[PDB]
A paper describes a structure:
Finally, in order to collect data immediately after Cu2+-induced discoloration of ZsYellow crystal, we added an additional 10 mM Cu2+ to the cryoprotectant solution. Upon undergoing discoloration, the ZsYellow crystal was mounted using a nylon loop under a stream of nitrogen at 100 K and X-ray diffraction data was collected. ZsYellow crystal immersed in Cu2+ belonged to the orthorhombic space group P21221, with a = 48.638, b = 72.929, and c = 124.189, containing two ZsYellow molecules in the asymmetric unit. The final model was refined to 2.6 Å resolution with Rwork and Rfree of 20.60 and 21.50%, respectively. ZsYellow immersed in Cu2+ shows the typical β-barrel fold with the chromophore located near the center of the β- barrel. As a result, the backbone between Phe65 and Lys66 is cleaved, consistent with previous reports for zFP538 and ZsYellow. Interestingly, although the ZsYellow crystal had been quenched by Cu2+, we did not observe a Fo-Fc electron density map (> 5σ) for Cu2+. Moreover, ZsYellow and ZsYellow immersed in Cu2+ showed high structural similarity with a r.m.s. deviation of 0.198-0.239 Å for whole Cα atoms. On the other hand, we observed structural differences were present in cyclized Lys66 of the chromophore. Although ZsYellow fluorescence was quenched by Cu2+, a reliable electron density map was not obtained for Cu2+, suggesting that Cu2+ can quench ZsYellow fluorescence without binding to it.
Residue numbers in the entry:
A (entry chain A), C (entry chain A), E (entry chain B), F (entry chain B): 69 to 230
B (entry chain C), D (entry chain C): 5 to 65
G (entry chain D), H (entry chain D): 4 to 65
Write the structure that this text describes.
């Protein structure tokens, strides 16, 4: 959910602007060992409840049986820098980020995210290409009965530093 | 502004299938859209326990 | 459905051998213009009915709005040669084929299929790597009320010719 | 042998979502497992008409 | 060298037709562990010598130190089946084959090949797309004083089998 | 040349540390239209001359005839943000950045870079992973007698922003 | 030590290449500020000009 | 015509290369049957041996 991104005043905030009607995205995941995941999400703001609804479909295949995913060898995603580019005539954005999953051995596991961010409303203002920096942590809090875990994120939009 | 306040509540419903394993997950959260911070708790309501790492789903909610 | 493949006597037929209980596969599609599809299928033989049941989930994203898929510029898949390799310790097969979709302009559109074929029964005999040659044609027979079309396939398993 | 005869009937149920468009397709067919030939007729029961080419689904049934 | 391909009557031999002047080709090699090689080749016939000259530039980067290439764990490429497609307006062919390097443990090391074959003179006649199956075997003949080895290659061009 | 990178106090400068002996690097370039370039570079300091020597081998194949490279439709690379990761046991760094070439029409031409940076002597101290942002501008100065041009590059190394 | 580096330095460039089978040679001279991360280089094609492709593909090569 | 080709022919090979920055030179001689699609070549590393990598990566190069 790219609404939970601190935007400075001088970069156009496509996601917050799309609200409350919301937006939809699709993302491909390409892992270095050939697994492929796709995700589709529908984000809508009920202003009555002051609440943000997420409806996600998530599919993935060809994770090797003894790979770090199926064997649960992963701790966290390494902190990242995503490139958000506009698509001038279609009024949509395109995410491109290279992601690393840290293995409990101290190594890495690479995935390519390619996202298409597409607002439900035809947007007035289109942003210029900028960056988003994310830090996403996970803590498993599984008990005897249910499997549960917590996530925390922090995302900030930036222009080029130069 | 645009229906958002500084503190907001979130709700997640994921339908998935990884490596032929079908599952379902729901979650609630709290987040600060202007501080770019969010914290969500997720619970598997079908296909528990998952045969794969929780990490691959993180960017999915 | 790789049961509709003529197998010679000297190549082990993993698919027909898996029956009637059947088998499951997952396939990634990578198109030259960045679209990604995933498909999962469950094939089961009801011997009562003499009938083959298919249950498929199909997801895909990031097809460009003015691409040949969204604009329906495709006639047929070009005839292909798939490489079926065993996976020795996991008792499963792995499809690898490069596919071309012929554009109505007379050009091509490339997709990489990577399939994992995985029988419900632990198989006695594992095949040696061989080839499958497919020819798949489509005819749209859409009317005013419903959208309908016919497919026909022909698939033959072969060893190397040398 | 293995539950198969030389002529056989087939049945297809696809649940999908392409580029955010959700759809459903069913089909029946006839095929000769030993001649490596099959012929199937498909009909969209939800999301007709499709916003994309029928070709991308062909290897999906 | 696709001059050394057995062609049937029914398919145009672009490669033999290019002689005695000859043809050039460029190939990309993408190994599954992220190594990337590039090869350019210039082929000429000396009709005086009945000898085919091969001038070859080959470059490679990012072979992992403790991977099968820098560890010499390869024995041979597996027999393959390349697809050969005409590019109608450029008067050139493109070559796509997924290649597999056999490891001593019994494993398999994937490398995508994408070639471009260019006659030195405008071919008057272009082939329709076809297959070429390849078997390519190596034998190290290295002594203490020199690193030497032998290759045998057998190639035959086929149309679609059905 | 990552010697010309402004490093802060808090991150180890592998590149300046490698001097005056210097470092070597290999890079793969994967363009979205299937072209593939490879570059090897050897960098040495002449302390006598206060001059940094660059010896470079650059090779490319499969640039489509009527694509933006062979048609000279590029103006400049867009400002980027590369990720730099230490390979702990090999005593080397890896560089991953998704690069974009601006077209004259206003379009965008993607190329994946994956680099390996190797000091000529075992570094005693390795950096932790970081970012390097780049701005790289070109100006053609070509006359009738010679093809010449100028590059300016500004690079700064950053840690994670949060 | 200073690893043989100065605030202001000089740079020389030799590129040997082949792109879609077209061979070429480029040399260059430049001025740089290693600690400021600022270089300016001038390049001349000395064999195989005029290049049939864009100079932009070589920029990250030098 | 016969495009300067025979049933039995001879082949010579020059490969100049660099792999993980290690430079090398290989030449070869061979005998071939162009119409039968059968070649046999012998290769010798003349500069940069012994190769730090597998000969297998060069096979499709020659």
């Amino acid at each position: 959910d790219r609404i939970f991104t601190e935007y400075p005043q001088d970069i156009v905030d496509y996601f917050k602007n799309s609200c409350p009607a919301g937006y939809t995205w699709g993302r491909s995941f390409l892992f270095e060992d050939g697994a492929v995941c796709i995700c589709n999400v529908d984000i809508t703001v009920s202003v009555k409840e002051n609440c943000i609804y997420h409806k996600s479909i998530f599919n993935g295949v060809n994770f090797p049986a003894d790979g770090p995913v199926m064997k649960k060898m992963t701790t966290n995603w390494e902190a990242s820098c995503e490139k958000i580019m506009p698509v001038p005539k279609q009024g949509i954005l395109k995410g491109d980020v290279s992601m690393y999953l840290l293995l409990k051995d101290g190594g890495r596991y690479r995935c390519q995210f390619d996202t298409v961010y597409k607002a439900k409303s035809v947007p007035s203002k289109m942003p210029e290409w900028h960056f988003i920096q994310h830090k996403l942590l996970r803590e498993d809090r599984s008990d005897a009965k249910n499997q549960k875990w917590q996530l925390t994120e922090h995302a900030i939009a930036f222009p080029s530093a130069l | 502004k645009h229906g958002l306040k500084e503190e907001m509540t979130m709700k997640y419903h994921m339908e998935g299938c990884v490596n032929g394993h079908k599952f379902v997950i729901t979650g609630e959260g709290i987040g600060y859209p202007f501080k770019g911070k969010q914290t969500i708790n997720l619970c598997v309501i079908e296909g528990g326990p998952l045969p794969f790492s929780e990490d691959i789903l993180s960017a999915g909610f």
